[PDB]
Write a protein that holds these residues in place. Structure first.
Motif, PDB file in Angstrom:
ATOM      1  N   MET A 259       0.837  -1.185   0.000  1.00  0.00           N
ATOM      2  CA  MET A 259       0.000   0.000   0.000  1.00  0.00           C
ATOM      3  C   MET A 259       0.873   1.237   0.000  1.00  0.00           C
ATOM      4  SD  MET A 259      -3.010   1.151   2.673  1.00  0.00           S
ATOM      5  CE  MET A 259      -2.095   2.173   3.797  1.00  0.00           C
ATOM      6  N   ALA A 260       2.055   1.213   0.599  1.00  0.00           N
ATOM      7  CA  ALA A 260       2.959   2.351   0.581  1.00  0.00           C
ATOM      8  C   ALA A 260       3.371   2.643  -0.849  1.00  0.00           C
ATOM      9  CB  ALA A 260       4.212   2.063   1.372  1.00  0.00           C
ATOM     10  N   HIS A 261       3.655   1.611  -1.650  1.00  0.00           N
ATOM     11  CA  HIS A 261       4.031   1.789  -3.047  1.00  0.00           C
ATOM     12  C   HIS A 261       2.823   2.102  -3.940  1.00  0.00           C
ATOM     13  CE1 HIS A 261       5.849   0.805  -6.861  1.00  0.00           C
ATOM     14  NE2 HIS A 261       4.793   0.046  -7.035  1.00  0.00           N
ATOM     15  N   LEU A 262       1.680   1.459  -3.714  1.00  0.00           N
ATOM     16  CA  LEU A 262       0.476   1.693  -4.481  1.00  0.00           C
ATOM     17  C   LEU A 262       0.010   3.107  -4.256  1.00  0.00           C
ATOM     18  CD1 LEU A 262      -1.965  -1.394  -4.447  1.00  0.00           C
ATOM     19  CD2 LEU A 262      -0.037  -0.999  -5.672  1.00  0.00           C
ATOM     20  N   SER A 263       0.122   3.619  -3.018  1.00  0.00           N
ATOM     21  CA  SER A 263      -0.301   4.980  -2.702  1.00  0.00           C
ATOM     22  C   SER A 263       0.725   5.999  -3.174  1.00  0.00           C
ATOM     23  CB  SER A 263      -0.506   5.108  -1.209  1.00  0.00           C
ATOM     24  OG  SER A 263       0.737   5.166  -0.538  1.00  0.00           O
ATOM     25  N   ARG A 264       1.934   5.491  -3.476  1.00  0.00           N
ATOM     26  CA  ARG A 264       3.079   6.237  -3.969  1.00  0.00           C
ATOM     27  C   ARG A 264       3.450   7.327  -2.963  1.00  0.00           C
ATOM     28  NH1 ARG A 264       1.883   9.329  -8.337  1.00  0.00           N
ATOM     29  NH2 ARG A 264       3.711   8.730  -9.622  1.00  0.00           N
ATOM     30  N   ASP A 265       3.076   7.165  -1.677  1.00  0.00           N
ATOM     31  CA  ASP A 265       3.288   8.180  -0.652  1.00  0.00           C
ATOM     32  C   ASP A 265       4.657   8.147  -0.023  1.00  0.00           C
ATOM     33  OD1 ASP A 265       2.885   9.354   2.335  1.00  0.00           O
ATOM     34  OD2 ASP A 265       1.338  10.150   1.062  1.00  0.00           O
ATOM     35  N   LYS A 266       5.398   9.217  -0.218  1.00  0.00           N
ATOM     36  CA  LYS A 266       6.737   9.356   0.305  1.00  0.00           C
ATOM     37  C   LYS A 266       6.789   9.231   1.810  1.00  0.00           C
ATOM     38  CE  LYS A 266       9.379  12.725   1.061  1.00  0.00           C
ATOM     39  NZ  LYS A 266       8.593  12.970   2.263  1.00  0.00           N
ATOM     40  N   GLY A 267       5.772   9.649   2.552  1.00  0.00           N
ATOM     41  CA  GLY A 267       5.799   9.537   3.995  1.00  0.00           C
ATOM     42  C   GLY A 267       5.876   8.086   4.423  1.00  0.00           C
ATOM     43  N   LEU A 268       4.970   7.238   3.892  1.00  0.00           N
ATOM     44  CA  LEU A 268       4.921   5.814   4.224  1.00  0.00           C
ATOM     45  C   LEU A 268       6.174   5.127   3.721  1.00  0.00           C
ATOM     46  CD1 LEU A 268       1.264   4.992   3.189  1.00  0.00           C
ATOM     47  CD2 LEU A 268       2.099   5.239   5.473  1.00  0.00           C
TER      48      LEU A 268
ATOM     49  N   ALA B 186       9.123   5.879   6.143  1.00  0.00           N
ATOM     50  CA  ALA B 186       9.026   5.169   7.412  1.00  0.00           C
ATOM     51  C   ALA B 186       9.655   3.805   7.262  1.00  0.00           C
ATOM     52  CB  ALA B 186       7.583   4.966   7.816  1.00  0.00           C
ATOM     53  N   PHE B 187       9.187   3.098   6.249  1.00  0.00           N
ATOM     54  CA  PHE B 187       9.720   1.786   5.956  1.00  0.00           C
ATOM     55  C   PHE B 187      11.195   1.866   5.594  1.00  0.00           C
ATOM     56  CE2 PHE B 187       5.174   0.612   4.943  1.00  0.00           C
ATOM     57  CZ  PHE B 187       5.053  -0.297   5.964  1.00  0.00           C
ATOM     58  N   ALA B 188      11.620   2.820   4.757  1.00  0.00           N
ATOM     59  CA  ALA B 188      13.010   2.926   4.334  1.00  0.00           C
ATOM     60  C   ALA B 188      13.977   3.197   5.459  1.00  0.00           C
ATOM     61  CB  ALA B 188      13.200   4.039   3.329  1.00  0.00           C
ATOM     62  N   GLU B 189      13.592   3.978   6.471  1.00  0.00           N
ATOM     63  CA  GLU B 189      14.527   4.259   7.548  1.00  0.00           C
ATOM     64  C   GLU B 189      14.332   3.379   8.784  1.00  0.00           C
ATOM     65  OE1 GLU B 189      13.875   8.511   7.563  1.00  0.00           O
ATOM     66  OE2 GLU B 189      11.942   8.412   8.509  1.00  0.00           O
ATOM     67  N   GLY B 190      13.755   2.196   8.581  1.00  0.00           N
ATOM     68  CA  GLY B 190      13.562   1.207   9.620  1.00  0.00           C
ATOM     69  C   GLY B 190      12.641   1.599  10.755  1.00  0.00           C
ATOM     70  N   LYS B 191      11.612   2.387  10.531  1.00  0.00           N
ATOM     71  CA  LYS B 191      10.783   2.771  11.656  1.00  0.00           C
ATOM     72  C   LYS B 191       9.598   1.856  11.781  1.00  0.00           C
ATOM     73  CE  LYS B 191       9.884   7.035  10.634  1.00  0.00           C
ATOM     74  NZ  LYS B 191       9.681   8.481  10.697  1.00  0.00           N
ATOM     75  N   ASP B 192       9.050   1.797  13.002  1.00  0.00           N
ATOM     76  CA  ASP B 192       7.847   1.027  13.245  1.00  0.00           C
ATOM     77  C   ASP B 192       6.773   1.884  12.618  1.00  0.00           C
ATOM     78  OD1 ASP B 192       5.956  -0.946  14.614  1.00  0.00           O
ATOM     79  OD2 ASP B 192       5.331   0.860  15.586  1.00  0.00           O
ATOM     80  N   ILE B 193       6.169   1.406  11.538  1.00  0.00           N
ATOM     81  CA  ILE B 193       5.165   2.223  10.883  1.00  0.00           C
ATOM     82  C   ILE B 193       4.044   2.701  11.762  1.00  0.00           C
ATOM     83  CG2 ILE B 193       4.985   2.227   8.417  1.00  0.00           C
ATOM     84  CD1 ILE B 193       3.164  -0.548   9.283  1.00  0.00           C
ATOM     85  N   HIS B 194       3.550   1.939  12.737  1.00  0.00           N
ATOM     86  CA  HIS B 194       2.417   2.444  13.503  1.00  0.00           C
ATOM     87  C   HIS B 194       2.770   3.625  14.392  1.00  0.00           C
ATOM     88  CE1 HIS B 194       1.354  -1.698  12.446  1.00  0.00           C
ATOM     89  NE2 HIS B 194       0.319  -1.020  12.033  1.00  0.00           N
TER      90      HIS B 194
ATOM     91  N   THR C  47      11.503 -11.626  -6.059  1.00  0.00           N
ATOM     92  CA  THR C  47      10.073 -11.445  -6.221  1.00  0.00           C
ATOM     93  C   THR C  47       9.861 -10.063  -6.823  1.00  0.00           C
ATOM     94  OG1 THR C  47       9.685 -13.040  -4.593  1.00  0.00           O
ATOM     95  CG2 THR C  47       8.013 -11.525  -4.730  1.00  0.00           C
ATOM     96  N   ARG C  48       8.971  -9.191  -6.340  1.00  0.00           N
ATOM     97  CA  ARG C  48       8.821  -7.871  -6.920  1.00  0.00           C
ATOM     98  C   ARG C  48       9.943  -7.026  -6.326  1.00  0.00           C
ATOM     99  NH1 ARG C  48       3.245 -10.140  -8.211  1.00  0.00           N
ATOM    100  NH2 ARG C  48       1.744  -8.437  -7.863  1.00  0.00           N
ATOM    101  N   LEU C  49      10.702  -6.261  -7.112  1.00  0.00           N
ATOM    102  CA  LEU C  49      11.724  -5.394  -6.522  1.00  0.00           C
ATOM    103  C   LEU C  49      11.227  -3.955  -6.352  1.00  0.00           C
ATOM    104  CD1 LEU C  49      14.903  -6.622  -8.441  1.00  0.00           C
ATOM    105  CD2 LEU C  49      14.383  -6.949  -6.058  1.00  0.00           C
ATOM    106  N   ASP C  50       9.948  -3.696  -6.629  1.00  0.00           N
ATOM    107  CA  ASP C  50       9.434  -2.352  -6.517  1.00  0.00           C
ATOM    108  C   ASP C  50       8.715  -2.102  -5.206  1.00  0.00           C
ATOM    109  OD1 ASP C  50       6.973  -3.899  -7.610  1.00  0.00           O
ATOM    110  OD2 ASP C  50       6.348  -2.232  -8.793  1.00  0.00           O
ATOM    111  N   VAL C  51       8.412  -3.146  -4.450  1.00  0.00           N
ATOM    112  CA  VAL C  51       7.688  -3.007  -3.200  1.00  0.00           C
ATOM    113  C   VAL C  51       8.763  -3.113  -2.137  1.00  0.00           C
ATOM    114  CG1 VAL C  51       5.967  -4.077  -1.737  1.00  0.00           C
ATOM    115  CG2 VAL C  51       5.626  -4.093  -4.160  1.00  0.00           C
ATOM    116  N   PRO C  52       8.796  -2.334  -1.039  1.00  0.00           N
ATOM    117  CA  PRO C  52       9.835  -2.457   0.001  1.00  0.00           C
ATOM    118  C   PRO C  52       9.570  -3.725   0.847  1.00  0.00           C
ATOM    119  CG  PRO C  52       8.260  -0.779   0.628  1.00  0.00           C
ATOM    120  CD  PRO C  52       7.959  -1.162  -0.818  1.00  0.00           C
ATOM    121  N   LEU C  53      10.257  -4.825   0.554  1.00  0.00           N
ATOM    122  CA  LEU C  53      10.022  -6.084   1.232  1.00  0.00           C
ATOM    123  C   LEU C  53      11.003  -6.369   2.349  1.00  0.00           C
ATOM    124  CD1 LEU C  53       7.614  -6.885  -0.325  1.00  0.00           C
ATOM    125  CD2 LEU C  53       9.056  -8.428  -1.693  1.00  0.00           C
TER     126      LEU C  53
END
Length: 560
Positions: free
Chosen positions: A346-355, A358-366, A540-546
């Motif tokens: 959903m972070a990639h589908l929403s294309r939202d830099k904020g989400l 969060a994922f890119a810098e190792g943060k707990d998303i919630h 697998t997909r390399l475009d989603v942050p897995l």
């Protein structure tokens, strides 16, 4: 009707060799096996059938043993004549649930290799919600043909015959028809599948390669300690007695605490503790669960009989059940789980830099979500806030209708709407997505996952059937749930390939939610976890942050 003059029953080698020569030169041929049991690992090959062209099909009886059964080619000789054809990868086969047939041949040491087309999966990839995808349904839909049902030749109930008891020619009509219809359906569905590179990529590179790995998952089975489960059943018997006594003594509120607890353990005992130890196969000593590949609308695999998905993930008694899935001696259970996969998708589908950040810098998303929505530093976000943000995030995944937040987070009213809009004010990309997806759901009639899999929403334009809104919800959830499914499936196929090629001391024993579970030798765990991790994240997909969090232990609960 259909009978003895259509198809040929092959009772002699010379005719069989003649048929093999024509199978060798057919572009694709239909293949089917008949057995004396639905349990793939205890089933016995009773006969096989092929079709090389619409209407030209044969049944080869190899083990009908009824009274005065006519002599037939012996099972061993039929299989050695057929083995090189069957094991030839360049000899393509069409079949209905080739997962079953590949397994039956694996009971004899044969590796089926031309698993090119499965008509159940052709159907499923065309439109998953079109109806039942079993051969008898498809024959009526695509060919307007009424097939000979198994209970028409065998009977119904306790006194249903087993295939080897059925007369040769009645057996032949059924089996040769199976072969024939499968081929006809293939010819009517394959050109359609070609029409759309989306559904064709998913069938060819995701659905089809998984048929032999689900067969390998299912035949490996899972090792279960029934003693543990018996102790757990004894204890729950006593705890349900005590809890009943507690509420009788009583006649932030104690009575509406013990009753709930009663209900929960009561159900768990019957749905798991009493049934699971009764599901051990006597030949392997393991429990083999049934993965259904063409049942969900989203493309997720569903499992039955041991429906591993319904055991309580976060519950202390659920953990207790997860401890009965045991690793054999000198092996350990390894659990490779995809972290918040639909929230990363959903972070990639929403294309939202904020989400995405969060994922890119190792943060707990919630916590990051709560820090941004509520505007407070990340280190002082209280548990009530982390929990409120979690309720927004998992609501978004299920497209959950705004008051849904007020029922999950059973406490606000339009304060929840304040939360919703505040979220979109910080994460606008999430509603641009939701607007865009609803829109194409109404424009095209279907939504797509990242790899092309489609969910058809035939009610998105329902003349206000009120809960017609459920298709809009399904419109926003399906792209996320389906991309998760596709990724899991690509991971399964990629990992099985490695296991098949390198052959390490590991075996893939189950798949549940976003997790792949394996048994691996205690001395090999370190390298096996390294490769599993690297294959699931990069192949697998390399475009989603897995992210794959890998675990191991002497039982599933420790691994998880």
């Amino acid at each position: 009707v259909i009978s003895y003059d259509n198809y040929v029953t092959i009772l002699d080698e010379e005719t069989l060799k003649a048929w093999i020569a024509k199978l060798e030169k057919a572009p694709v041929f239909a293949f089917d096996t008949e057995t004396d049991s639905l349990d793939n690992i205890s089933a016995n090959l009773v006969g096989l059938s092929f079709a090389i062209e619409p209407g030209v099909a044969a049944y080869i009886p190899v083990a009908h043993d009824y009274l005065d059964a006519p002599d037939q080619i012996s099972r061993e000789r039929a299989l050695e004549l057929l083995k090189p054809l069957l094991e030839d990868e360049k000899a393509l086969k069409v079949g209905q649930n080739l997962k079953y047939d590949r397994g039956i041949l694996a009971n004899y040491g044969i590796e089926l290799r031309g698993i090119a087309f499965d008509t159940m999966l052709e159907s499923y990839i065309l439109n998953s919600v079109a109806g039942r995808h079993d051969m008898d349904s498809l024959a009526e839909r695509w060919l307007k043909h009424k097939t000979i049902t198994f209970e028409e030749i065998a009977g119904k109930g306790k006194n249903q015959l087993t295939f080897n008891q059925i007369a040769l020619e009645e057996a032949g009509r059924y089996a040769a028809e199976d072969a024939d219809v499968t081929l006809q359906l293939h010819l009517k569905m394959w050109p359609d599948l070609q029409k759309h590179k989306g559904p064709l990529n998913v069938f060819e590179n995701i659905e089809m390669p998984l048929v032999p790995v689900l067969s390998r998952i299912e035949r490996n089975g899972v090792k279960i300690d029934p003693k543990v489960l018996h102790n757990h059943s004894e204890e729950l018997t006593l705890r349900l007695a005590e809890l009943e006594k507690k509420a009788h003594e009583i006649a932030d509120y104690p009575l509406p605490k013990v009753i709930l607890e009663y209900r929960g353990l009561a159900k768990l005992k019957s749905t798991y503790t009493d049934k699971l130890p009764l599901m051990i196969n006597p030949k392997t000593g393991r429990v083999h669960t049934s993965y259904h590949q063409a049942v969900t609308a989203t493309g997720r695999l569903s499992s039955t009989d041991p429906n591993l998905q319904n055991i309580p993930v976060r519950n202390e008694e659920g953990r207790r059940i997860r401890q009965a899935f045991i690793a054999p001696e000198d092996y350990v259970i390894v659990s490779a789980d995809y972290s918040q996969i639909e929230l990363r998708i959903m972070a990639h589908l929403s294309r939202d830099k904020g989400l995405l950040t969060a994922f890119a810098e190792g943060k707990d998303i919630h916590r990051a979500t709560a820090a941004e929505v509520f505007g407070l530093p990340l280190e002082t976000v209280t548990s009530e806030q982390r929990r409120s943000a979690k309720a927004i995030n998992f609501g978004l995944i299920y497209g959950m209708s705004a008051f849904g937040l007020a029922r999950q987070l059973n406490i606000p009213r339009k304060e929840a709407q304040k939360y919703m809009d505040l979220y979109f004010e910080r994460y606008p990309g999430v509603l641009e997505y939701m607007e865009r997806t609803r829109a194409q759901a109404k424009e095209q009639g279907y939504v797509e996952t990242l790899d092309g899999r489609r969910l058809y929403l035939p009610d998105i334009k329902s003349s206000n059937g009120a809960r017609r809104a459920a298709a809009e919800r399904a419109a926003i959830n399906a792209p996320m749930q389906g991309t998760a499914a596709d990724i899991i499936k690509r991971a399964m196929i990629a990992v099985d390939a490695w296991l098949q090629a390198e052959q390490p001391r590991v075996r893939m024993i189950m798949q549940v939610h976003d997790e792949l579970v394996f048994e691996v030798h205690k001395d090999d765990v370190d390298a096996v976890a390294k490769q599993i991790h690297q294959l699931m994240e990069n192949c697998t997909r390399l475009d989603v942050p897995l992210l794959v969090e890998v675990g191991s232990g002497e039982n599933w609960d420790q691994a998880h």
